[PDB]
Amino acid sequence: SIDVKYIGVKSAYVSYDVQKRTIYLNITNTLNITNNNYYSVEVENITAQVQFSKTVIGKARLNNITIIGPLDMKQIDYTVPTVIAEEMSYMYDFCTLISIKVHNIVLMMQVTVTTTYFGHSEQISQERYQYVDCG
Amino acid sequence: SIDVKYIGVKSAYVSYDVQKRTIYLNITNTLNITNNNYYSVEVENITAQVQFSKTVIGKARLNNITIIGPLDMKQIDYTVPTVIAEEMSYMYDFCTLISIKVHNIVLMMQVTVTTTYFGHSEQISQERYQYVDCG
Amino acid sequence: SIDVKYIGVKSAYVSYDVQKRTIYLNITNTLNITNNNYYSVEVENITAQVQFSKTVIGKARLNNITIIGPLDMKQIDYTVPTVIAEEMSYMYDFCTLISIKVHNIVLMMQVTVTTTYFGHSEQISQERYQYVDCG
Ligand SMILES: *[C@@H]1O[C@H](CO)[C@@H](O)[C@H](O)[C@H]1NC(C)=O
Ligand SMILES: *[C@@H]1O[C@H](CO)[C@@H](O)[C@H](O)[C@H]1NC(C)=O
Ligand SMILES: *[C@@H]1O[C@H](CO)[C@@H](O)[C@H](O)[C@H]1NC(C)=O
Ligand SMILES: *[C@@H]1O[C@H](CO)[C@@H](O)[C@H](O)[C@H]1NC(C)=O
Ligand SMILES: *[C@@H]1O[C@H](CO)[C@@H](O)[C@H](O)[C@H]1NC(C)=O
Ligand SMILES: *[C@@H]1O[C@H](CO)[C@@H](O)[C@H](O)[C@H]1NC(C)=O
Ligand SMILES: *[C@@H]1O[C@H](CO)[C@@H](O)[C@H](O)[C@H]1NC(C)=O
Ligand SMILES: *[C@@H]1O[C@H](CO)[C@@H](O)[C@H](O)[C@H]1NC(C)=O
Ligand SMILES: *[C@@H]1O[C@H](CO)[C@@H](O)[C@H](O)[C@H]1NC(C)=O
Ligand SMILES: *[C@@H]1O[C@H](CO)[C@@H](O)[C@H](O)[C@H]1NC(C)=O
Ligand SMILES: *[C@@H]1O[C@H](CO)[C@@H](O)[C@H](O)[C@H]1NC(C)=O
Ligand SMILES: *[C@@H]1O[C@H](CO)[C@@H](O)[C@H](O)[C@H]1NC(C)=O
């Protein structure tokens, strides 16, 4: 990465900004920009790149082989009882949430057993979180 | 990475900013920018890159093999009872949350058993957290 | 990394900033910038890079092999009883939370058993935390 920027409201290379109830009288502006950008990014010069994988088995007896990849998500229980008994009452529930395992951004790569990789891996995330807003 | 920037509200290379109720009278501005940027980033020169993996088995007896990858997420219980008994009452629940295992940003890479990698891995995250806002 | 910056509100290379209720009278501005940036970042010159892995087994008897990767997340119980008995009362619950294992940013890399890596690993995180805001 080169340039990652947080800007909440206003991004401006040049901003002549005037707010409300202003007397903008007798202003003379002269502006010159000579902006030059040169990028030479992510260059590879490989004469020879070799990835080699060999598995050899010879007169071998194999038994009881178990191979499990990542994320073995197994034997899990969720129990959220909600038992409400009522009699002659005044209920006022305005902003109440019951959230179970909510996914917002999930990013997973190359989640494997055997991997041979030559190169680049890049992730960028930019949001603004706001879960609950109740007036 | 080169340039990572936090800006909450306003980002400006040049900002002539005037707020409210202002008398902006008799101003003369002369502005010159000569901005030059040169980037030579992430360059690799490899004459020979070799990755080698060999597994050899010879007249071998194998039994009871168990290989488990990462994140063996196993035998877990969640129990959240909510038993409310009522009689002749006034309930006022405004902003109440019941949150269980909420995912917001999950980033995981290359979560494997056997990995051979040559290169770059980059992650950038920029947000603004705000879970609960109740008036 | 080179330049990581915290800016809460306002970031400006040049800021002529005037607030409210101001008499900006008779101002003469002359401004010159000659800004030059040169970057030569993350350069590698390898004539020969070799990664070598060999496993050899010869007439060997193997039994009771258990290999477990990282994050063996096993046999865990959560119990949060909420038993409320009521009779003829006035309840005022404004801003109450019940949060269990909430994920906000989780970043994990290369969480493996066997890894052979040549290169770069970079992470940048910039947020603004605010869990509970209740008026
Ligand atoms: C604005 O400039 C003109 C010419 O320079 C001048 O005649 C005028 O009086 C100026 N305005 C004020 C309010 O002085
Ligand atoms: C930019 O413009 C101004 C306006 O008069 C001038 O004086 C200056 O020489 C210019 N610069 C370039 C690099 O063009
Ligand atoms: C890649 O190409 C040739 C091969 O070695 C090399 O001479 C050249 O300088 C390299 N180019 C860049 C932009 O790095
Ligand atoms: C392992 O082998 C025994 C007998 O050889 C068998 O009963 C058992 O089920 C095997 N394990 C698995 C996980 O299959
Ligand atoms: C603004 O400038 C002009 C010309 O220089 C001048 O005549 C005028 O009086 C100035 N304004 C004030 C308020 O002095
Ligand atoms: C920028 O502009 C000003 C305006 O007069 C000038 O005096 C100066 O020589 C300029 N500089 C360049 C580098 O162009
Ligand atoms: C990569 O390419 C050639 C190969 O060695 C080298 O002479 C050159 O200087 C390198 N280029 C850069 C931009 O590093
Ligand atoms: C290990 O081997 C025994 C007998 O050889 C078998 O009963 C058992 O199930 C094996 N273990 C697993 C995890 O399968
Ligand atoms: C602003 O400048 C002009 C010209 O230099 C001058 O005539 C005027 O009186 C100035 N303003 C004030 C308030 O003195
Ligand atoms: C920048 O601009 C000013 C404006 O007059 C000038 O005097 C100066 O020589 C300039 N410098 C360069 C490096 O252009
Ligand atoms: C990398 O390329 C060649 C190979 O040795 C070397 O002469 C050159 O100076 C290097 N380039 C950089 C930018 O370091
Ligand atoms: C280890 O071996 C014994 C008998 O050889 C078997 O009963 C047991 O289950 C094995 N352990 C595991 C974890 O499988």
Side-chain angles (χ1 to χ4, degrees):
Chain A
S1 174
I2 301 300
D3 189 23
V4 58
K5 289 275 191 139
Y6 204 43
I7 302 105
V9 174
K10 175 161 61 178
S11 168
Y13 190 82
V14 179
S15 64
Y16 293 172
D17 274 15
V18 188
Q19 206 73 358
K20 59 171 218 181
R21 190 42 204 101
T22 59
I23 303 188
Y24 211 81
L25 175 57
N26 277 81
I27 297 93
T28 305
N29 301 57
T30 308
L31 203 167
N32 196 352
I33 295 169
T34 300
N35 189 0
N36 296 315
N37 296 29
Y38 304 79
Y39 297 92
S40 191
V41 185
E42 293 118 0
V43 180
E44 291 101 279
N45 270 327
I46 295 91
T47 314
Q49 204 275 332
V50 175
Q51 293 153 2
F52 179 84
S53 193
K54 117 169 341 140
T55 303
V56 188
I57 298 93
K59 63 179 73 175
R61 311 180 158 78
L62 281 72
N63 196 346
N64 281 69
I65 301 84
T66 301
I67 303 168
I68 298 178
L71 276 296
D72 190 76
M73 162 56 164
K74 180 178 230 208
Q75 187 54 267
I76 297 169
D77 294 332
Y78 300 42
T79 304
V80 181
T82 296
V83 178
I84 186 167
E86 215 26 47
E87 150 276 346
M88 170 62 223
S89 288
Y90 297 170
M91 292 202 92
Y92 293 92
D93 188 358
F94 191 83
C95 47
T96 293
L97 272 77
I98 295 96
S99 55
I100 303 304
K101 191 177 178 53
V102 181
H103 323 307
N104 213 146
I105 293 170
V106 299
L107 308 189
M108 239 179 30
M109 345 110 78
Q110 247 206 27
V111 180
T112 57
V113 174
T114 300
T115 178
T116 308
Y117 170 46
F118 189 110
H120 294 269
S121 297
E122 287 94 328
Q123 296 191 336
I124 302 174
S125 178
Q126 299 175 326
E127 45 272 37
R128 166 194 159 161
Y129 206 72
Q130 193 167 352
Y131 198 55
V132 174
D133 194 289
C134 68
Chain B
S1 174
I2 301 299
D3 189 23
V4 58
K5 289 275 191 139
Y6 204 43
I7 302 105
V9 174
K10 175 161 61 178
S11 168
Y13 190 82
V14 179
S15 64
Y16 293 172
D17 274 15
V18 188
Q19 206 73 358
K20 59 171 218 181
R21 190 42 204 101
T22 59
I23 303 188
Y24 211 81
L25 175 57
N26 277 81
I27 296 93
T28 305
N29 301 57
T30 308
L31 203 167
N32 196 352
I33 295 169
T34 301
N35 189 0
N36 296 315
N37 295 29
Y38 303 79
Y39 297 92
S40 191
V41 185
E42 293 118 0
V43 180
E44 291 101 279
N45 270 327
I46 296 91
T47 314
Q49 204 275 332
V50 175
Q51 293 153 2
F52 179 84
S53 193
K54 117 169 341 140
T55 303
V56 188
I57 298 93
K59 63 179 73 175
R61 311 180 158 78
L62 281 72
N63 196 346
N64 281 69
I65 301 85
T66 301
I67 303 168
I68 298 178
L71 276 296
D72 190 76
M73 162 55 164
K74 180 178 230 208
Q75 187 54 267
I76 297 169
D77 294 332
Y78 300 42
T79 304
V80 181
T82 296
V83 178
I84 186 167
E86 215 26 47
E87 150 276 347
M88 170 62 223
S89 288
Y90 297 170
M91 292 202 92
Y92 293 91
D93 189 358
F94 191 83
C95 47
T96 293
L97 272 77
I98 295 96
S99 54
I100 303 304
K101 191 177 178 53
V102 181
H103 323 307
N104 213 146
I105 293 170
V106 299
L107 308 189
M108 239 178 30
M109 345 110 78
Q110 247 206 27
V111 180
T112 57
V113 174
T114 300
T115 178
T116 308
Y117 170 47
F118 189 110
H120 294 269
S121 297
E122 287 94 328
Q123 296 191 336
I124 302 174
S125 178
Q126 299 175 326
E127 45 272 37
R128 166 194 159 161
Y129 206 72
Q130 193 167 352
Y131 198 55
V132 174
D133 194 289
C134 68
Chain C
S1 174
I2 301 299
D3 189 23
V4 58
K5 289 275 191 139
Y6 204 43
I7 302 105
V9 174
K10 175 160 61 178
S11 168
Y13 190 82
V14 179
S15 64
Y16 293 172
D17 273 15
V18 188
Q19 206 73 358
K20 59 171 218 181
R21 190 41 204 101
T22 59
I23 303 188
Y24 211 81
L25 175 56
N26 277 81
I27 297 93
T28 305
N29 301 57
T30 308
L31 203 167
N32 196 352
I33 295 169
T34 300
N35 189 0
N36 296 315
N37 296 29
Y38 304 79
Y39 297 92
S40 191
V41 185
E42 293 118 0
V43 180
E44 291 101 279
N45 270 327
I46 295 91
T47 314
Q49 204 275 332
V50 175
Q51 293 153 2
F52 179 84
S53 193
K54 117 169 341 140
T55 303
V56 188
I57 298 93
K59 63 179 73 175
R61 311 180 158 78
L62 281 72
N63 195 346
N64 281 69
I65 301 85
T66 301
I67 303 168
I68 298 178
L71 276 296
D72 190 75
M73 162 56 164
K74 180 178 230 208
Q75 187 54 267
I76 297 169
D77 294 332
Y78 300 42
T79 304
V80 181
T82 296
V83 178
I84 186 167
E86 215 26 47
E87 150 276 346
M88 170 62 223
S89 288
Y90 297 170
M91 292 202 92
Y92 293 93
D93 188 358
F94 191 83
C95 47
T96 293
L97 272 77
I98 295 96
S99 54
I100 303 304
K101 191 177 178 53
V102 181
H103 323 307
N104 213 146
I105 293 170
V106 299
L107 308 189
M108 239 178 30
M109 345 110 78
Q110 247 206 27
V111 180
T112 57
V113 174
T114 300
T115 178
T116 308
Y117 170 47
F118 189 110
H120 294 268
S121 297
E122 287 94 328
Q123 296 191 156
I124 302 174
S125 178
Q126 299 175 326
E127 45 272 37
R128 166 194 159 161
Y129 206 72
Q130 193 167 352
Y131 198 55
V132 174
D133 194 289
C134 68

